[PDB]
């Protein structure tokens, strides 16, 4: 119970960090997708 | 420059726009 | 304790689902980034 | 078509490559 609580909390901390990293990487992807779409429009015009 | 080339760039940009809107949704919902 | 264990389990479930969604969306962004990089190289060729 | 336009597309593709390798890292570490 004390040990279960502690291991449930550490799994939460872990997923929380993973989600944070995934979210950051996705915001970077968002920005680079937009920059490549603008270059594709410039190249095709 | 060909019709098939223009159609390909339109398809790709349109898919990119659908993904940009979906990304924005994902990022706001995970807030 | 029963109620705590359940709430920690439901937060874990929640974060697990969020991670799954973020991961899926990032795999999609990966594929689209590659497709845009290939179109950039075709247009600048 | 200009030297600046070529340098721009090179910068953009090289940044896209760095982000592709980082995405692959992130996706493998996740699993």
Curated annotation (Swiss-Prot), chains A, C:
Mutant phenotype after disruption: Cells lacking this gene accumulate pupylated proteins. These cells also become hypersensitive to reactive nitrogen intermediates (RNI) and are severely attenuated in both wild-type and nitric oxide synthase 2 deficient mice. Moreover, they display increased resistance to hydrogen peroxide.
Residue pairs linked by disulfide bridges in the UniProt entry: none
PTM description: Mpa thus promotes its own turnover.
Function (record text): ATPase which is responsible for recognizing, binding, unfolding and translocation of pupylated proteins into the bacterial 20S proteasome core particle. May be essential for opening the gate of the 20S proteasome via an interaction with its C-terminus, thereby allowing substrate entry and access to the site of proteolysis. Thus, the C-termini of the proteasomal ATPase may function like a 'key in a lock' to induce gate opening and therefore regulate proteolysis.
Swiss-Prot/TrEMBL domain comment: Consists of three main regions, an N-terminal coiled-coil domain (residues 1-96) that binds to protein Pup and functions as a docking station, an interdomain (residues 97-245) involved in Mpa hexamerization, and a C-terminal ATPase domain of the AAA type (residues 246-609).
Assembly description: Homohexamer. Assembles into a hexameric ring structure that caps the 20S proteasome core. Strongly interacts with the prokaryotic ubiquitin-like protein Pup through a hydrophobic interface; the interacting region of Mpa lies in its N-terminal coiled-coil domain. There is one Pup binding site per Mpa hexamer ring; the K(D) measured is about 3.8 uM. Upon ATP-binding, the C-terminus of Mpa interacts with the alpha-rings of the proteasome core, possibly by binding to the intersubunit pockets.
Protein family according to the UniProt entry: Belongs to the AAA ATPase family.
Other remarks in the entry: Was identified as a natural substrate of the M.tuberculosis proteasome.
The name this protein goes by in its record: Proteasome-associated ATPase
Species in which this protein is naturally found: Mycobacterium tuberculosis (strain ATCC 25618 / H37Rv)
Gene: mpa
Residues represented out of the complete protein: 52 to 96 of 609
From Swiss-Prot, chains B, D:
Region (Mpa/ARC ATPase binding): 1-31
Post-translational modification: Is modified by deamidation of its C-terminal glutamine to glutamate by the deamidase Dop, a prerequisite to the subsequent pupylation process.
Domain of life (superkingdom): Bacteria
Coiled coil: 3-31
Subunit structure: Strongly interacts with the proteasome-associated ATPase ARC (Mpa) through a hydrophobic interface; the interacting region of Pup lies in its C-terminal half. There is one Pup binding site per Mpa hexamer ring; the K(D) measured is about 3.8 uM.
Summary of the function given for this chain in its UniProt record: Protein modifier that is covalently attached to lysine residues of substrate proteins, thereby targeting them for proteasomal degradation. The tagging system is termed pupylation. Among the identified substrates are the FabD, PanB and Mpa proteins.
UniProt remark on domains: The N-terminal unstructured half of Pup provides a signal required to initiate unfolding and degradation by the proteasome but is not needed for pupylation, while the C-terminal helical half of Pup interacts with Mpa to target proteins to the proteasome.
Family stated for the protein in its record: Belongs to the prokaryotic ubiquitin-like protein family.
Additional detail: The glutamate must be located at the C-terminal position to be coupled to the lysine substrate. Fusion of Pup to a nonproteasome substrate targets it for proteasomal degradation in an Mpa- and proteasome-dependent manner.
Listed name of the protein: Prokaryotic ubiquitin-like protein Pup
Shown part of the complete sequence: 21 to 51 of 64
């Amino acid at each position: 119970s004390a040990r279960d609580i502690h291991q449930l909390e550490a799994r939460i901390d872990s997923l929380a960090a993973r989600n944070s990293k995934l979210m950051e990487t996705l915001k970077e992807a968002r920005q680079q997708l937009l920059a490549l779409r603008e270059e594709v429009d410039r190249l095709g015009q | 420059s060909t019709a098939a080339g223009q159609e390909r760039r339109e398809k790709l940009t349109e898919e990119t726009d659908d993904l940009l809107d979906e990304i924005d949704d994902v990022l706001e919902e995970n807030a």
